[PDB]
């Protein structure tokens, strides 16, 4: 990607739906860091509309995930969680935020998850119940989510999520993608600001 | 529910929670005695006309398969990806290990006795061998094929994940569209109870 599909935007709307220095100020340094270092590169996530770019964690964010070791295993908590009201809740495990804050070191990178203008337009239309409108002035690509992490590559989506995606309300399961996600999530867990699952 | 001629209940030993220190003869005898004594013991239709079940007092002191999750024991839970069979995909599961469970489990309030018709027992015993099925007309009409120690007077919901895996023919299982209301019900139960499993850590 060059000046044609640059600089990057940050969709405020589609961004508010993906999250548990101001927006403008943050966007300014991303685009700067991108023009500089003509070596930073984009990696296709999975869909032709999802792309990732990895930059240094200039905001000091803690990682959203950490390794499970024999010594910290007892800190895990688990429970049935629905990311949003219409989703069926699913068994999930995590390390509490309080532990991550006192243990962890500022993640090495920020994984910027980018969506195409067209995809943002389609998803904003569905969520908003408005028309699918594409502004040719709008950036070709925009940041919809940021994940702090030490690995310079996309981490697999949770296993349960892959199964969730096969439910009618509608496609077959990629069994190898599933095996791979399990391999990773067997020995790592997300961070969540929740000390207990009991209600 | 049920006809005097459809009593006493039998017990297919080639199938049968753990029951200890009692013979299969004595067990069946006490089950039948408990049944004919208390007119309040109800039989509940299973799903297909060949399954049925009833709840009786837990006279063998069998321990349940799970424990309640409380504020004091929540941190003792362990979790990991487990496959119930070598040909199945592993799924996230949580449990209380024996280091806690051995000092928490107590005899359950009831036994959910699962019954199968004489017909279905002959059929599966034969299918298990593919042998010509021989039915003994004098065999009990209903026989106990499973016994579940539990504290609740209702069918314990299967695990939420089991319900999901059953919607995947490729990995199942029915293939039928998930009954979302049954799933929610199952989740409500499993949010506050966890199975017991002899595994101290998830790491391998």
């Amino acid at each position: 990607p060059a000046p044609a599909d640059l600089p990057l935007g940050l969709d405020p709307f589609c961004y508010r739906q993906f999250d548990d220095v101001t927006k403008e100020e943050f966007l300014e340094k991303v685009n700067e860091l991108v023009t500089r270092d003509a070596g930073i590169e984009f990696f296709q996530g999975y869909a032709p509309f999802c792309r990732h770019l990895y930059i240094p964690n200039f905001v000091g964010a803690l990682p959203g995930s950490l390794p499970i070791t024999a010594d910290n295993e007892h800190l895990l908590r688990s429970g049935y969680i629905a990311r949003r009201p219409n989703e069926l809740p699913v068994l999930t495990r995590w390390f509490p935020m309080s532990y991550a804050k006192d243990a962890l070191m500022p993640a090495a990178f920020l994984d910027l998850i980018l969506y195409s203008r067209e995809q943002i337009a389609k998803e904003t239309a569905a969520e908003s119940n408005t028309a699918v409108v594409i502004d040719p002035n709008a950036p070709a690509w925009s940041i919809i989510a940021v994940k702090a992490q030490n690995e310079k590559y996309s981490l697999p989506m949770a296993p349960i999520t892959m199964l969730r995606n096969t439910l009618i309300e509608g496609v077959a399961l990629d069994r190898e993608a599933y095996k791979a996600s399990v391999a990773y999530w067997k020995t790592h867990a997300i961070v969540m600001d929740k000390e207990s699952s009991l209600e």
Side-chain angles (χ1 to χ4, degrees), chain A:
Chain A
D5 296 348
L6 187 164
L8 305 180
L10 183 163
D11 190 54
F13 182 99
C14 219
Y15 187 89
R16 84 183 68 182
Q17 290 198 343
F18 300 114
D19 60 350
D20 282 337
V21 185
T22 305
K23 288 185 173 185
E24 296 80 20
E25 185 166 312
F26 174 84
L27 180 56
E28 290 184 355
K29 293 220 303 178
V30 166
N31 285 315
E32 171 174 289
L33 295 171
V34 172
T35 299
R36 290 162 51 195
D37 186 358
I40 302 186
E41 57 188 5
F42 305 89
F43 297 87
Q44 177 179 165
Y46 59 111
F49 54 81
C50 183
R51 204 154 193 171
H52 301 268
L53 82 62
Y54 302 92
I55 61 174
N57 183 13
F58 66 89
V59 71
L62 300 74
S65 131
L66 58 143
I68 301 166
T69 68
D71 291 332
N72 74 10
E73 180 183 16
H74 67 281
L75 296 165
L76 292 165
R77 292 298 186 272
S78 60
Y80 284 89
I81 307 308
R83 323 173 214 170
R84 61 189 305 178
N86 59 352
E87 289 177 11
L88 288 184
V90 299
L91 188 51
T92 319
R93 64 173 175 186
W94 64 88
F95 282 110
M97 181 84 82
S98 60
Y99 164 62
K101 284 186 181 182
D102 302 338
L104 305 189
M105 212 74 178
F109 308 101
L110 292 170
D111 176 355
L112 309 197
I113 301 70
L114 305 171
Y115 265 39
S116 70
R117 170 197 303 165
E118 23 293 326
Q119 188 67 10
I120 290 169
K122 292 179 178 178
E123 297 202 13
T124 301
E127 191 66 16
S128 187
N129 279 309
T130 61
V132 188
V133 185
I134 302 179
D135 184 350
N137 294 321
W141 296 99
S142 297
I143 304 169
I144 61 163
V146 174
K147 295 178 63 168
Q149 60 186 46
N150 292 327
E151 27 290 279
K152 270 202 169 190
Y153 60 84
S154 180
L155 301 163
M157 74 176 61
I160 195 64
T161 310
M162 293 183 60
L163 287 182
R164 190 205 309 264
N165 298 354
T166 84
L167 299 174
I168 302 185
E169 294 190 358
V171 292
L173 183 64
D174 183 343
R175 316 230 325 167
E176 293 70 16
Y178 185 90
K179 290 180 292 184
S181 171
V182 167
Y184 184 86
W185 297 105
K186 267 182 155 71
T187 66
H188 296 83
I190 63 179
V191 174
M192 283 187 51
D193 187 2
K194 193 168 180 60
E195 303 295 334
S196 171
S197 69
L198 299 183
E199 307 175 348

